[PDB]
Amino acid sequence: KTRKESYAIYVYKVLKQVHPDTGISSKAMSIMNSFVNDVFERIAGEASRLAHYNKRSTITSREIQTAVRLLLPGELAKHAVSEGTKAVTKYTSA
Amino acid sequence: KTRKESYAIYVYKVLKQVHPDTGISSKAMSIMNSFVNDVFERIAGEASRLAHYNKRSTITSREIQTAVRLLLPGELAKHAVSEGTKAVTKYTSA
Amino acid sequence: HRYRPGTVALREIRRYQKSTELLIRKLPFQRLVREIAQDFKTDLRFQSSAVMALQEASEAYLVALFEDTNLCAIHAKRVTIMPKDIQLARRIRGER
Amino acid sequence: PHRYRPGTVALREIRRYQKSTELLIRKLPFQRLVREIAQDFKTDLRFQSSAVMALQEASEAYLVALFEDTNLCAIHAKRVTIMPKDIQLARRIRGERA
Amino acid sequence: RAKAKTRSSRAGLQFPVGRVHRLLRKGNYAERVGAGAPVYLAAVLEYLTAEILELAGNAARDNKKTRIIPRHLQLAVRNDEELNKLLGRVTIAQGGVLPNIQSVLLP
Amino acid sequence: RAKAKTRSSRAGLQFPVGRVHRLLRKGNYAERVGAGAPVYLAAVLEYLTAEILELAGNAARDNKKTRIIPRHLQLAVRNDEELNKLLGRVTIAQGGVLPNIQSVLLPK
Amino acid sequence: RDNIQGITKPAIRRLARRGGVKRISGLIYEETRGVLKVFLENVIRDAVTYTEHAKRKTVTAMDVVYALKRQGRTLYGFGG
Amino acid sequence: RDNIQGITKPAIRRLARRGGVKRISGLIYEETRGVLKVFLENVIRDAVTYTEHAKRKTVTAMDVVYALKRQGRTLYGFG
Questions:
Q1: In terms of CB atoms within 10 Å, which end of chain B has fewer, N or C?
Q2: Where are the beta strands (DSSP E) in chain F?
Q3: In the complex, which subunits touch G with 3 or more CB pairs below 8 angstroms?
């Protein structure tokens, strides 16, 4: 049978991080999978448009940062930006 | 200087085909250029989505026809399809 | 014994705003969907998930439309919703 | 002396301003307002003339469409006057202040 | 070699097929682009442009004017059902509005 | 060759950096994709998932339940201004509606 | 083949109750049926177009999801 | 700088007349000023974000056009 990739194990890992004794059903996992795919596509499309506007041919972390700033509303965006930066720096150190 | 391509001479050719005695100003030409770019972007994006859904690496005339049928409203779409089809016939024969 | 008009209506409002189920019978909706799709292609098949998704979308759309209709009716100093409220809500939303 | 009944000059103005295509807001006050608004986001910002012109065109189109919806809301409640509750209802139904 | 013949003339169009092909190839839409996709797209764009310009020129003529200004484009688009539905969320600069007064307001 | 360690472990994440990089490369977004873009995207996605899951788990706990169902996700999203703005045009299956009644209709 | 009457008056009344409506006029039901038929026609037409492009004969759930997302009515839970 | 008062009452009356409004209550001018301020704040914030991404100090017409387009308010006539 052909393998069907999904964001299920990662969503479950995050859920165990946040609520260690709370489970999740199958419909809720489908909804979370759709949410992750939707947000990924939105941010990636905005970043691609930003790259095309400035006559660049590379999607960098600055394009992703500006796409997150444009798309996510208010305080959310700020926190998201922080998290993103917090990752890249760490990734560079190792 | 630099070169700035636009759909101005082609729009003027179509206008001379339709209204041989009627001219067009500069703001109206800017509006027409924006309209052509917007419709091109819409149709091409929808065709790209259609190709991605079916796991195809190629944009063909079938994708363009389906995008036209999905986007253009009402009898407009029908007429557009005819025009497009005729072109792809006259191009293939010659 | 008999409740005053508008009491059971409020009870029903409170009851159906707590549940999550579908408020339209499934078989009539499936028949309606098949009849509508008959006019586009002949001898069409439907996955069960397709009909369920159509039902969910339609019910959500109708509930939101009725919320807007209730707002329009209250604007005119009324309690009942009339077709003119539906038409105004749809026209302002851009659907007509 | 001569005098027109209330609503005659209003209808004349409605007919006059639905036939023209000009901009109905003075350009210098709008430019000053745009600069003051943009002052919060970044300091020492320069604007092209086309940027301000585009902002003015978009703002005027938005306001005219909102006033059309507001007029519909006012007529719904059997009125001729335009009240803030009509603006609020139109913006709620449109999905803006909802 | 033989003399060059543009693909637009070969397909009988006025819009450019080579430029449309290049824009499709460099626009990041798909890994490959077919041979007949630019021809179809150019034909569709030419059809829509001809429709808009026909209506706009008629509006200009009814106004006793020779040149087409944005007001005529707005009148052409807004008075046509299909074109109004296509350009439903689009603002045309210096276009104005459509003359329309509610009947209840009239004396 | 050293022992392979995932990129998401170096960044200290749970979402997959490698899969996100592959999806960015294969998705026809741009000709080239930088080395730090997948890490940023994975971090942002993990943040959003953690936020919405925390809210949904709180909503489930307030209902004296143990398992998250779509009703709890809808209650979490609709009760939060930023998340409601992010998901304004989104329908959640079997979510229901937020309980409210206009003050005009209540008996006086 | 008059299955538009399968959407009965009690069902429309329940849908109105979920929307917070207390009193309903008698002519609301025909208007609601027309509105629902228009919405269904648009969505199903788009879904059938998506199905036909794939050279299939069954209308899958993903076709419906894409058709809804085209109109700006993203739906979570069915498909991916 | 209180430049929101530069959008005068007669200007709002003209914008309402183009919209077909016959009679106008005296309380809609402050409401219209608030609505316009909110709209302008959103659009200008997006335009300045687009400008800052390009490492520029001048807000071009293309930034405004993109900021409007990403809100579903496409504007034709400025490129």
A1: N
A2: 32-33, 67-68, 90-92
A3: A, B, C, F
Domain that holds residue F13: 3-108
For residues C42 and D56, what is the distance between their CA atoms, to the nearest angstrom?
Answer: 52
In three-state secondary structure terms, E90 is: strand
Sign of the dihedral through C-alpha G19, G22, G28, G33 = positive
| Residue F97, domain CATH | 1.10.20.10
CA-to-CA dists, residue F106 to B39, D77, E51, F37, angstroms: 51, 22, 55, 54
Closest CA to B53 of B44, B61, B63: B63
CA distance F100 to chain B (A): 38
User: Hey, what domains does chain A have and what are their CATH numbers?
Assistant: 1-94 (1.10.20.10)
Q: How many domains does chain E have?
A: 1
Task: Please name every residue paired with F91 in a beta bridge, in sequence order, or none if there are none.
Answer: G75
Q: How far is D51 from chain E (nearest CA, A)?
A: 13
Residue C23 DSSP class = S
Q: Name the DSSP class of D65.
A: H
Q: Does any CB of chain G come closer than 8 Å to the CB of residue B70?
A: yes
Nearest by CB: H20 against E94, E96, E101: E101
- Interface touch H76/B27, C-beta < 8 Å: no
Domain of G68 in residue numbering reads as 3-80
CA-closest candidate to residue F43, choices A39, A5, A48, A94: A39
Closest CA to F37 of A40, H63, E81, B5: A40
Instruction: Tell me the three-class secondary structure of C72-88, residue by residue.
Output: HHHHCCCCEECHHHHHH
Structure tokens at H19: 């919209």
* Contact residues on chain H for B27, CB-CB shorter than 8 A: 77
Residue closest to A79 by CA, chosen among H48, F48, D20, B13: F48
How many CB atoms are located within 10 Å of the residue E92 CB? 27
Q: How many domains does chain H have?
A: 1
Which residues face F90 on adjacent strands? G74
H helices of D3-94, in order, are 8-17, 27-41, 49-76, 84-94
CB pairs under 8 A between A and G: 17
Assign residue H41 the CATH number of its domain: 1.10.20.10
Alpha carbon distance A84, H4 (integer Å): 38
For G76, list phi and psi in degrees, rounded to 5. Answer: -105, 135
Number of domains present in the structure of chain D? 1
What method was applied to determine this entry? cryo-EM
- What DSSP letter does each residue of B69-93 carry, written as one string? HHHS-THHHHHHHHHHHHHHHHHHH
CA–CA distance from C10 to each of F53, F100, G21, G50 (Å)? 33, 11, 9, 43
Question: What is the DSSP track for G63-78?
Answer: HHHHHHHHHT-EEESS
Instruction: Give CA–CA dist E31/H46, Å, rounded.
Output: 32
Q: Which of B24, B31, B25 is nearest to B6 (CA)?
A: B31
How far is residue H29's CA from residue H13's CA, in Å, rounded to a whole number?
9
